[PDB]
Curated annotation (Swiss-Prot):
Regulation: Inhibited by 2,4-dioxo-4-phenylbutanoic acid (DPBA).
Reactions mediated catalytically: RNA(n) + a ribonucleoside 5'-triphosphate = RNA(n+1) + diphosphate
Taxonomy of the source species: Viruses, Riboviria, Orthornavirae, Negarnaviricota, Polyploviricotina
Note on domains (UniProt): The N-terminus contains the endonuclease activity (endoN). The central region contains the RdRp activity. The C-terminus contains the cap-binding region.
Protein name in the entry: RNA-directed RNA polymerase L
Enzyme nomenclature, EC number: 2.7.7.48, 3.1.-.-
Portion held of the full protein: 226 to 1609 of 2151
Organism: Hantaan virus (strain 76-118)
Gene it is expressed from: L
Length: 1340
């Protein structure tokens, strides 16, 4: 049922009125919004912005410190050990005690060295003892620390400690001297870093990546400095515990040449805490900035740099810990991009320079560099086009102050590069190429590298280089304290502008729109946040001209949106996305989760309402918005999400029916527009004269790339109302359309709330600036203020895209009506937030006298709008298009919008951006970023899955293999399972490290190909199959021992309760690891006990395959989902408390579950060996093992078989780069889904039966389907489905789910998973051509 909502009565909007308005508008001069790229213009823009930056900022004469850790290396670095730490610390203290301190930091260092070197033998024994054998001493109260009180502290040291415990200038970027000094310093550091200290995939890796990348960088100073930095950051992390951070610590490295002093500090477990440390090193080549050192002590022919006190937080510490891996993966990505651009491997000097640059960027994590590279990502396209908004981007380069030498150096390089690129465009000339399927005239002009003296053939290599640089910075830098405040002020500024417009014109005009006659009378109404009602209606008519031919499809799509389906039974409504909660007693808006709000509603309700019913029950509630705590993003409340879902469902249903013409979802619309444009340009124009003669006019094209659909804080949602009122749908009534209009009306006004963090920051300002004064004045009660028009980045993308398409069609009709005699062209295409506009204009073939005479005569004959057509007609085309878009509330961005002629590189970049949305380097670096902390097996699986996802995003298999190796090495380091460390399974399990199951610390190192095809768990499956075969054939003892290990893991799993689900069924046992959740701090996690939840899960088995629809079962199901360890870990990902477990993992504490106790991983291994030694196989165990080996894991072994049965050979042909395209990695009797059939099988209750009936598409066939499949299991494999255990084992074998992976490939590849695998095998070499031998389908 749909309640009767009020509709909108149509207005008498006339297209000819808009045509007359455009006639008047085009009769005068208009300003083009973009600037010509000239080289001199870019240089002058840089100089003027330098002068302005000098004006706005107070001057600093001393560049700030940018190196968090200062050190030097002259010899190959050996990783630190406890014995090496002791020896190096003794030698280092002996070295330091001979020196004469000058500065207070030097005095503190001397005092610390004296205290450490005078600790007793028991103190030294307990200083390096593990937590198990540690015994507290008077001086040593924590394992790796000691005590240093004021009795032995000097006066200078004590004063310095007291000072430690208890306006924004900028460098003079306009000075050539400041640039010269910064360039000199950074050049010296980079040269120091570059110095040298003194399977088929396996073969390709050893010949290419090992030879040209790994062997080159293995000897560089950067490699060993990175390992030394990893050791230092490990010490700093180990000191960050609650008990240990209050004491002092001393560590040493490189035979005493590097010394770390750790001072008492607040623990990193609690948020907003810093570790303080001082690094003392021998002066030499490395990460040395002598001008920023605290002091330089002199010894006989030697120097010791003592740094100032460094305070580092948890995120910066983790980034510095993984800096070496980040730099190596960035350099490997650069390696692959270089081989793609040039077709050859880079030389040693270029790889060394790239690696040094990447390492310097990765160790120096600051927001200024990240913002600079973010801006460069769009600055590079802005100087390679004909027209762009590069002055605005160069201005954006100067928003924050310049503080360090590194910032000045990067800016100087960027200015040089951009001026060089802009000066390249002056050699533009017309030529001939083969675009799409035509020979067309293109206007082309050597792109220098940014870190080496390499020149690319394409500027997309430059763009990807800058992108990889930008992703070297942690995503935790965004947000911080400047971005949150900035987004708050931007929102409040746009709301204040909306209020000013309301005061000037009245609330009705800003909400309902202005009329065309008012626009003619005032001419200032054409702006952002205001729209013309006539323009909205006419754009709706223009879109209706396309929609009226597909009315049936649009209607069927809308009714296919399932408006009567229960709201909270859908996945998107029970997710962990993030949602605003309730207004608390103190008056703030709560940051909450979608599932938590779902449980809050159901617990206070008696039914699971549908979307329309939920909208009617919450209609009267006000929309509320907030900034997300830490994850510039907004979160809204449940009624706001419901209204946005109504609007977006309606408009997605409508917009999917024009996806092949205007809105690319794939690239068909853009290719069609390009084909039409190129076909049009092939012809010639003949303008008819009054004297029956003709003028010959030549056709040319201009392309504009713009982000027109992207959400803007300056916008008015109310326009959509009239749009919705006039858009044609096939429905016979207006109830659904009226409901959409009503939802739009209810989303108009929002309560935007300040955050607690920002409020505290404001209260700590101590000096309220005028903009801060206005921002605080925006909130009457100090908590929330009303916002209108702006929908706060809510999901309305399909509506905005459809609206933009309608306005572009309106412009197309208006321009056709303006020049009936002229034969002009216009074609546009939308893809996500991007849009490509193609204008086809006319130029005189001759000198142009006849054309000028014709234009003058047309002007004299009263057609005054021909003034805009005399020269540069495409400019007037774009001006009128932009003005018409502004008649809605669409402003084409002055920045980030590029204008080009026909150009192969421009179109290639646009199509590449359309095909791929995420660079694979982002996923590659996020693999090292952080781990879920759920144990060895889970962390390994997560890292491997991220590497496979990166491979799906276009990463070469060699780069992905290197990333897999690095991630596996890091996980083994964290859990101690690698050889030589205390958690190595080979010391307890009496089997080989490769014969050990992964949950028991086994060797998880696997090929990237098998991980991508077979999956992220096939090591255990292969081990089980081999052990079963060996025992069943030869009855060997070792195979029985491996089976016993698997049975021990299975018993471990049975000890715990993991109901799981069809999509996450597990059969190989897993060690249960300690997860220090906030003890279920979640609000509604305490509704039902774990025992009650386990009983419910056992009783209701059908709900393990489908989702309940009734309120009670849904509430219990959602509580159970809340109580999932994996969901708990994800819901506390950004909590600063997690590191405790990491430390407990590194200290090898009692973090594993065994016999209802918390024990060490070593104790788990000992129990595993004890169980496996006495284990004897039974009939039930052998039967089960056969079901898993031959049936459950059957699909994965098949991909392995195909992998092992393939043959590839090198063809004497150079590799050819191709356009990248997305494909689907997807690998009949039963007409219902397997989850529905199985739930029907297990349905015993009326509620469960009804739930499966609603879930199933064809309920009537359900039983029949079950029957036939119940035959197959008892016919193809001879197993009894009637047993629930057998059903659970066989269900994931019969479930052909997932495969919804999207893989980026080249053009030739097909959509078959076998084709994707064959393409991956052909891309196993970065230079050579690989041909597969079978040349047929060899996958079962």
């Amino acid at each position: 049922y749909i309640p009767d909502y009020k509709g909108m009565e149509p207005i008498g909007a006339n297209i000819e009125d808009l045509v007359d308005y455009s006639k008047d508008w085009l009769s005068r001069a208009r300003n083009f919004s973009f600037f010509e790229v000239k080289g001199t213009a870019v240089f002058e823009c840089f100089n003027s912005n330098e002068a302005n930056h000098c004006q706005r900022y107070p001057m600093s004469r001393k560049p700030r410190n940018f190196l968090l850790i200062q050190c030097s290396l002259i010899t190959s670095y050996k990783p630190a050990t406890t014995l090496s730490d002791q020896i190096d610390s003794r030698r280092a203290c002996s070295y330091i005690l001979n020196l004469i301190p000058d500065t207070p930091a030097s005095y503190l260092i001397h005092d610390m060295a004296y205290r450490y070197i005078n600790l007793t033998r028991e103190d030294m024994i307990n200083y390096y003892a593990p937590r198990i054998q540690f015994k507290q001493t008077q001086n040593v109260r924590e394992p790796g620390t000691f005590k240093l009180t004021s009795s032995m502290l000097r006066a200078e040291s004590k004063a310095m400690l007291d000072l430690l415990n208890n306006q924004i200038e900028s460098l003079n970027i306009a000075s050539h001297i400041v640039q010269s000094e910064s360039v000199s310093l950074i050049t010296k550091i980079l040269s120091d870093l570059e110095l040298n200290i003194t399977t088929v995939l396996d073969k390709f890796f050893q010949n290419e990546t090992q030879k040209y990348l790994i062997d080159v960088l293995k000897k560089t100073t950067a490699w060993h400095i990175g390992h030394l930095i990893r050791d230092i950051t490990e010490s700093l992390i180990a000191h960050s515990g609650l008990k240990r951070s209050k004491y002092w610590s001393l560590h040493s490295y490189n035979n005493g040449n590097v010394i770390l002093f750790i001072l008492p500090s607040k623990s990193l477990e609690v948020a907003g805490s810093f570790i303080r440390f001082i690094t003392v090193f021998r002066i030499g080549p490395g990460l040395v900035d002598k001008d920023n050192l605290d002091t330089i002590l002199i010894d006989g022919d030697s120097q010791w740099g003592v740094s100032k006190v460094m305070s580092i937080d948890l995120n910066r510490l983790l980034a510095l810990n993984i800096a070496f891996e980040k730099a190596l993966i960035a350099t490997a990505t650069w390696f692959q991009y270089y081989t793609e651009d040039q077709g050859q491997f880079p030389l040693q000097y270029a790889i060394r320079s790239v690696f040094a640059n990447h390492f310097l960027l990765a160790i120096c994590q600051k927001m200024k560099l990240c913002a600079i590279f973010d801006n460069l990502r769009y600055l590079i396209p802005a100087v390679t086009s004909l027209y762009s908004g590069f002055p605005s981007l160069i201005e954006k380069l100067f928003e924050r102050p310049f503080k360090s030498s590194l910032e000045v150096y990067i800016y100087y390089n960027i200015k040089s590069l951009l001026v060089a690129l802009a000066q390249n465009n002056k050699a533009r000339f017309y030529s001939k190429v083969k675009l799409l399927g035509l020979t067309v005239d293109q206007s082309t002009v050597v792109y220098p590298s940014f870190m080496s003296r390499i020149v690319y053939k394409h500027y997309r290599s430059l763009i990807s280089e800058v992108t990889t640089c930008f992703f070297l910075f942690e995503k935790g830098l965004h947000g911080n304290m400047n971005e949150e405040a900035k987004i708050h002020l931007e929102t409040v500024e746009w709301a204040l502008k909306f209020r000013e417009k309301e005061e000037k014109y009245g609330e009705s005009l800003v909400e309902n729109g202005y009329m065309m006659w008012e626009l003619r009378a005032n001419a200032e109404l054409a702006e952002q946040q205001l729209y013309c009602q006539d323009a909205i209606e006419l754009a709706a008519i223009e879109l209706n001209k396309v929609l009226a031919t597909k009315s049936s499809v649009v209607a069927n799509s809308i009714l296919s949106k399932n408006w009567e389906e229960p709201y909270f039974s859908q996945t998107r409504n029970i997710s962990l996305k993030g949602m605003s909660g309730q207004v608390q007693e103190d008056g703030h808006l709560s940051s909450s989760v979608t599932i938590i709000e779902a449980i809050r509603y159901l617990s206070n309700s008696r039914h699971n309402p549908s979307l329309l019913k939920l909208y009617e029950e919450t209609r009267e509630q006000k929309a509320m918005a907030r900034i997300v705590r830490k994850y510039g993003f907004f979160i809204t409340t449940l009624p706001t999400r419901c209204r946005l879902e109504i609007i977006e469902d309606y408009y997605d249903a409508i917009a999917k029916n024009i996806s092949e013409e205007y809105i690319s979802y794939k690239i068909l619309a853009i290719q069609g527009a390009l084909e039409k444009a190129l076909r049009w340009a092939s012809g010639e124009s003949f303008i008819e004269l009054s004297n029956h003669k003709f003028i010959r006019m030549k056709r040319k094209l201009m392309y504009v790339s713009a982000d027109a659909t992207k959400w803007s804080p300056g916008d008015n949602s109310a326009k959509f109302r009239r749009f919705t009122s006039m858009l044609h749908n096939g429905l016979p009534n207006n109830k659904l359309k009226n409901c959409v209009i009503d939802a739009l009306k209810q989303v108009y006004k929002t309560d935007f709330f300040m955050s607690r963090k920002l409020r505290n920051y404001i209260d700590s300002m101590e000096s309220l600036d005028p903009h801060i004064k206005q921002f605080l004045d925006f909130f009457p009660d100090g908590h929330h203020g009303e916002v209108k028009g702006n929908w706060l980045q809510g999901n309305l993308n399909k509506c905005s895209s459809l609206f933009g398409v309608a306005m572009s069609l309106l412009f197309k009709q208006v321009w056709t009506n303006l020049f009936p005699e002229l034969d002009c062209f216009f074609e546009f295409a939308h893809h996500s937030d991007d849009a490509l506009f193609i204008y086809g204009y006319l130029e005189p073939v001759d000198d142009g006298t006849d054309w000028f005479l014709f234009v003058s005569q047309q002007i004299q004959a009263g057609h005054l709008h021909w003034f805009s057509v005399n020269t540069e007609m495409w400019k007037s085309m774009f001006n009128l298009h932009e003005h018409i878009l502004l008649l809605g509330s669409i402003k084409i961005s002055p920045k980030k919008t590029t204008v080009s002629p026909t150009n192969a590189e421009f179109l290639s970049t646009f199509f590449e951006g359309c095909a791929v949305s995420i660079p694979f380097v982002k996923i590659l670096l996020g693999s090292l970023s952080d781990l879920p902390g759920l144990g060895y097996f889970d962390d390994l699986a997560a890292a491997q899955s991220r590497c496979v996802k990166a491979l799906d995003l276009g990463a070469s298999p060699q780069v992905a293999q290197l990333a897999v190796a690095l991630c596996t090495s890091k996980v083994e380091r964290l859990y101690g399972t690698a050889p030589g460390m205390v958690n190595h399974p080979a010391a307890y399990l009496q089997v080989k490290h490769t014969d050990t199951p992964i949950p028991l610390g086994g060797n998880g190192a696997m090929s990237i190909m098998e991980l991508a095809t077979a999956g992220i768990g096939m090591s255990d499956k292969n081990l089980l199959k081999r052990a079963l075969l060996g025992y069943s054939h030869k009855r060997q003892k070792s195979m029985l021992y491996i089976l016993g290990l698997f049975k021990f893991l299975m018993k471990l799993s049975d000890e715990t309760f993991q109901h799981e689900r069809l999509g996450q069924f597990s059969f190989i046992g897993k060690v249960q690891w300690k997860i220090f959740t906030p003890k279920s701090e979640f609000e509604f996690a305490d509704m039902y006990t774990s025992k009650f939840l386990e009983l419910w899960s056992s009783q209701h088995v059908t709900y393990d395959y489908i989702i309940p629809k009734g309120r009670d079962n849904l509430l219990i199901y959602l509580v159970r989902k809340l109580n999932d360890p994996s969901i708990v870990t994800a819901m506390t990902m950004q909590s600063p408390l997690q590191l405790r477990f990491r430390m407990q993992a590194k200290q090898h504490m009692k973090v594993c579950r065994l016999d209802g106790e918390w024990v060490t991983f070593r104790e788990v291994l000992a129990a595993a060996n004890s169980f496996a030694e006495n284990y004897s196989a039974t009939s039930q165990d052998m039967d089960l093992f056969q079901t898993l080996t031959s049936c459950t894991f059957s699909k994965e072994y098949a991909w392995k078989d195909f992998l092992n049965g393939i043959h590839c050979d090198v063809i004497p042909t150079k590799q050819v780069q191709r356009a990248k395209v997305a494909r689907t990695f997807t690998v009949q009797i039963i007409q219902n889904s397997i989850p529905a059939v199985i739930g029907y099988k297990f349905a015993v209750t009326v509620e469960e039966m009804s739930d499966v009936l609603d879930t199933a598409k064809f309920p009537d066939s359900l039983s029949v389907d079950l029957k036939t499949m119940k035959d197959g299991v008892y016919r193809e494999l001879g197993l009894d489905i009637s047993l629930p255990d057998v059903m659970k084992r066989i269900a994931p074998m019969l479930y052909k789910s997932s495969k919804s992976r999207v893989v980026i490939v080249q053009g030739n590849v097909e959509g078959t998973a076998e084709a994707i695998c064959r393409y991956w095998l052909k891309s196993m070499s970065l230079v050579k051509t690989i041909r597969v031998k079978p040349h047929k389908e060899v996958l079962q």
